[PDB]
DNA sequence: TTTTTTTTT
DNA sequence: AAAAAAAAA
């Protein structure tokens, strides 16, 4: 992806390109994927130059109708990240794919942050061993990152211990406003270095307590829908796979599984791949594909041990 | 439909016909179906020639009162596209008809993009096997097109794999402004080649996040009403059937089904055929006719398997 | 942690800093960890100064992306409090850690307030003998504190009897509203003196009787989720370890351990370390790790005698 | 015109 | 084996 230093080849002053770096449009695709309405709200941008900054941006990126046999060629280089086990790769037909949003949920001991700890090491492998190249990013909301679990998986694949821990960016969000502000700093780091998985663990922990009651429900869902839109804008800009962790609630009053995830119909439509984790005989757990555009509905089996997620 | 090259037979200069191709009036019916007020806003068109360009256009197309026994004859050649199953053709009395707008909605795993993947292959069949002739068009908003599902339905009907994928145009919209701009390029492609289904998956995903709050509600609905007007103008120009995908919201505060679609009273009046999809025992799902000018209210049953939508 | 007396170095009037001490933001980290939405609800705070009070607070605390090899360095100084026995330290790999929430539950004679009486004396030891330095805090809901059990454990470690009892703050909650109000006075005492364990015995005794029935379930869980959020805000501000005591209920209607704790899915996701206590041959009891981000699932053995919890 | 939450015994 | 309530933009 090209930076916005290519935009002095219209004739824009250099000061206006400094303004766009304040607004988070660090990449030239972020200008072309943005509407005209949102570009006006930057202080110092008029109607005339915002007409010029959008049409000149549509020079450099291809936006228009193409053939589906050319888009089928472009899906052939999609990287799929392995999860550590052969049984989960039998479900996802190669693992978690890049350029998309994947959501995992379940109650309370089903290993949601254990997969996210295993995936931060398999995303640094060479592509011949599974997974892609690059570093990783971890956005944490409840305060469970523990780095002693990352070193145990590098013990399994034989990687260096210090090279694994130094190539992981960590940031902790303390409220819903700080959670959105960490995405603007995330887009400013991806243009220097090649990345992989952006992990938002868990995304919906802070939305349950900052907005409470029926009276503050509509203000909650508009903030969550804007947050899931920026995660979608990050996945197509840099080719980053996104992993989202959710929670569940019970249904006291239904009639005849009773645990459905939170977020309503906004997070249900925004996420495209959804996995449902539940516990069996706890040595092992059970993964089940809940919603996917391509994969059929099936199940698999887990293993959580000292070397990450296994068979 | 006749192109606008027939309009030098008034005495217009050739330069003014070049101007109308900038404004999207590629077909001679698009001039006659347009008001005088909208033709003035093209740079270089005066009051005198716009009076001449409209009345000369009303020479070539029939606009006026006719007998209903002649319009009943003209409904006899309406093509109806099959959906793949015999159970849904029992509802729609032959399938999805051409020259109209059809809307499907439901929550989150009810197979809305699975019907739209099945319909992009049955619209290329010969007319003796069901469906019509021509290519297909897919406008995508959330990024789920996957072409590996298109090849699995060509495995069912025995068509060639490469001939199916090469005859589908694909374009991805990134905001609401780009979604309207893809319709002007759509009207410039239909005059060379015979087409079929224009699929706008989903139409109302981007309108939830670009315009938020009660203060920006009135600016949202005026853009959506102009977008549904251009889809209606495409259906009568070329005889193209339009399939629209919608989403749902919940009603926290009503009293006694609770999921009603989004778009308000604008998309409810503009769309004329509406199908409500819900899930039963998930192997199968349930379709229900919600609103139609001719079809009675009834239900049917689904099947989603490896070969598309089945029985 | 810095007090909010450092906030006259923006240019705020001294009266607005007096207002924040009414709202419980006694520490400068409590301003930076708070959202903008919650700061507006203080009487006398406008939109302009609340924008200034948050960005100036983000000067003094580090909030942003860092390297995981630097966060791994910061976990090396985490204090772990001993529980009195060597067998429980073999489970927790050093004992109860600081900066987190630990939950213990079991039925009715499993020694839940006997561990909490033992931990109020081992948290005053020098760090060479196990545990950390500082005083202790006990929030009681059912009225069982008895101080004659605290003197018996100081008999074991050889500490002074009067110095142990004088360094423990005690407060009894009488309803759920008074239980939340004791946390605002708790944050105003930690900035003068160095502390340790905040013990909320038991947290969920009063929530069973003040809110009863299915009709008052949703109002119960929103109050409990706000209470567990303030306990999490206390643990990262001052580095205080939090110990929570829970109760159990039976499941009349399940099919094949039958005793699951109360609080639903809110207290299950908020607490990160959970211990399950049950009784064997009562001289001894059995501890079992139920849910932890790092520790594996195993068991241990207890001893309750005259000198606290032993081997 | 928009926006679902919440397990007891 | 059988249970119910909740609101603001
Ligand atoms: N080193 C380890 N060896 C084996 N099992 C472990 C180890 N560390 C953790 N576990 C188990 O892994 C699970 C932890 O799952 P985890 O995702 O961290 O919690 P969770 O599902 O997120 N619930 P919560 O974080 O409270 O919302 C528990 O079953 C632990 O017993
Ligand atoms: N190859 C397949 N075989 C069987 N079932 C499949 C297959 N591919 C997808 N499915 C199922 O079909 C459904 C997909 O529905 P789909 O319409 O694509 O999502 P959706 O209803 O649009 N929700 P969303 O796209 O997020 O708004 C899911 O139930 C999948 O499990
Ligand atoms: N043959 C039929 N038998 C029974 N019900 C029918 C039949 N044809 C249509 N309907 C029902 O009649 C209703 C449609 O009535 P209609 O007058 O078209 O409402 P409408 O307001 O005009 N729709 P719209 O034009 O978008 O505003 C729907 O509920 C259909 O299910
Ligand atoms: Ca977790
Ligand atoms: Ca869809
Ligand atoms: Ca009508």
Author numbering:
A (entry chain B), B (entry chain A), C (entry chain C): 22 to 277, 282 to 336
Article excerpt on this structure:
Eukaryotic RAD51 and DMC1 both catalyze strand displacement and strand exchange. Interestingly, DMC1 possesses the ability of stabilizing mismatch-containing recombination intermediates (low-fidelity recombinase), whereas the RAD51 lacks the ability to do so (high-fidelity recombinase). RAD51 and DMC1 are members of the RecA family of DNA recombinases and share ~50% amino acid identity and similar biochemical properties.
To test the hypothesis that DMC1 Loop 2 residues P274/G275 (relative to V273/D274 in RAD51) provide flexibility for DNA basepairs, we further solved the structure of the dsDNA filaments of the double mutant RAD51-VpDg (where the small letters represent corresponding residues from DMC1) (Structure 5, 3.43 Å). Furthermore, the Loop 2 residues in RAD51, V273 and D274 can form a V273:L238 hydrophobic/steric gate and a D274:R235 salt bridge, which can “lock up” the neighboring triplet basepairs. Comparison of the solvent-accessible volume of the cavity shows that the volume around D274 and R235 of RAD51 is cleaved by the salt-bridge interaction, suggesting a rigid environment. We then further performed MD simulations to compare homologous and mismatched structures for the three postsynaptic filaments where the structure with bound dsDNA was available to provide starting coordinates: DMC1, RAD51, and RAD51-VpDg. The RMSD values of mismatched DNA are substantially larger than those of homologous DNA for RAD51, but only slightly different for DMC1 and RAD51-VpDg, supporting that DMC1 can stabilize mismatched basepairs. Analogously, the Loop 2 reciprocal mutants DMC1-PvGd and RAD51-VpDg changed to 81% and 100%, respectively. As expected, although the 15 nt mismatch substrate is closer to the 15 nt homologous substrate than the 12 nt homologous one in WT DMC1, it is closer to the 12 nt homo in WT RAD51.
